[PDB]
Amino acid sequence: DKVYQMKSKPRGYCLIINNHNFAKAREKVPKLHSIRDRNGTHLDAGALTTTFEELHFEIKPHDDCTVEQIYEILKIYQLMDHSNMDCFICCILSHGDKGIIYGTDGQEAPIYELTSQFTGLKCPSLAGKPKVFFIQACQGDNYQKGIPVETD
Amino acid sequence: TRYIPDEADFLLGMATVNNCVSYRNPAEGTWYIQSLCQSLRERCPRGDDILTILTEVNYEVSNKDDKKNMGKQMPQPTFTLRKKLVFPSD
C-alpha cells in the first residue's frame, strides 16, 4: 500500500478555530435569537492540542471567530509556505447548519468555502500532501433517530 | 511532470451527517472530538491509518445516546485521499 510521507518535524500546522461566545449572533441575526454559547468547547481544543502535539504538529489556536475572521486566518495559511511540512490540519469547533458552519456573529461559512482554500492551485506548497479538516458542529436541528440491532 | 486533481488529498471528518445535531457535554467536551482524540492517541502508536481510526470513531459515537430526546449521532468522513494516511508517533 502507498502511504503519504509523514516524517517532517513538525508534521505541519494544526489550526484550531474554537468558537464559544455567540452573543453577536444572538444580537444580530433574528433567527439565532436563542443560539447558545458553546460551554465546554475549550475541553475539545485542549484535547486536540494534546493529541496533535503528541503527533508532532504545531498547534495554532484561535478563539471566538466571526466568519470574516475565519476567512482571514485561512487566507494566512493558504499563503504560507508549507514546503517543509508533510500535512496540514484544520479543526473547527462551532455551531452550524446544513452544509455550513456559523461564525460567532451568526454569519454562515459553507464548508466547501473553507476546504477549497487549500486546493493544490490555491496552496501549491501542500500539493500532493494530505489536508485534513475536522468539523465539530451541528448540520441542522434534527435529532438522529436510533434503530435496534443485536449486540456484538 | 505528472498531474493529479486540484481537489486530491483531502480528508473531511464531520461530527454528523447532514440535517442533524451533534452533541456537546459541557463537562467533558463533544462526543466526536473526545472520541477522535482517544482513538488517535491509542491507535496512532500502533500504526493504524486514519480511515481505520475514523471507522472506530463511527462505532464508538454510534453507541452513545441522548436519553432526554432519544437522540443518536452519526459521524461521517469524506475523502479524496490517494494513499494511506498514518501519523507516526515517532
Binding site: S94, H95, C138 | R24, N25, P26, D66
Partner: peptide, 4 residues
C-alpha cells in the same frame, strides 16, 4: 448534554 447540549447540541451544537
Amino acid at each position: 448534554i447540549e447540541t451544537x
